[PDB]
Amino acid sequence: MPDVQYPINTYGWLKKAVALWADRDDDEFVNQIPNFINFAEKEIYRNLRIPPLEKEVYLDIKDGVAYIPPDYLEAQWMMRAKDGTIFQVTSPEEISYRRQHPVNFARFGSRFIFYPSIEADTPYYPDDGSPLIPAENSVILSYYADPPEFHEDTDTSTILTIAPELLLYFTLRHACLFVQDDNGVQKWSALGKAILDEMVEQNKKQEYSGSPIAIPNNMTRL
């Protein structure tokens, strides 16, 4: 019954296009549409990893530590605004030693540690209100973040602009679960997975793309 534009971009239209691609249109079903959608986006973001959801951010090292962002899922490079000087990661069982007798950081519950006992300061922020005079001593982190659940109609996300059919099939999945037309389940799921792998490969053929890699012969003086 419903009708939709061509270039699906909003949760608002998606909530209807789903009801469409499946024949049955009833309140036992629509009013839980959104639940299905939640399920699907969660199932995706749970293991999907790509740039568009990445993030730059400064930290607030007090003393060799820092508390982890609520929104954090998984980490990629960290370093200093200056000189680069990439950090690397290790376990406590080593860092504690390095305390007794480059940079090393590790994960203690909700806390990050660093051996050399650093100090960074999050920007000076506001006042007149033109920029965020960043602080010298700043370290910057790149981490994949939990995206926001829509919770709104007109709302949107990069995805829909990109790969909506994905969300579509994947939520149709849990829908065909609500009511037991499985074979459709299988179809939806297969297609979602195929799409997803296409994506990750789009990224893989990217992350090293430029020219032949060549393994560095990093040798310290002498």
Partner: protein, 50 residues
């Protein structure tokens, strides 16, 4: 949904539904018609149930 069927031209009618109890109407309003139906044949699939 509703559609025209114009004989000699169209061989079928595309209707999208999934409800467990279908209905149909056939209407013939037109003046210059003497058509008839011997029978139907409804194409369908199966979903499930809640």
């Amino acid at each position: 949904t509703s559609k025209t069927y114009t004989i000699g031209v169209d061989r079928h009618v595309s209707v999208r539904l999934n409800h467990p109890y279908l209905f149909y109407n056939v209407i013939d309003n037109d003046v210059n018609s003497n058509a008839a139906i011997n029978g139907l044949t409804i194409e369908f699939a199966v979903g499930g149930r809640r």
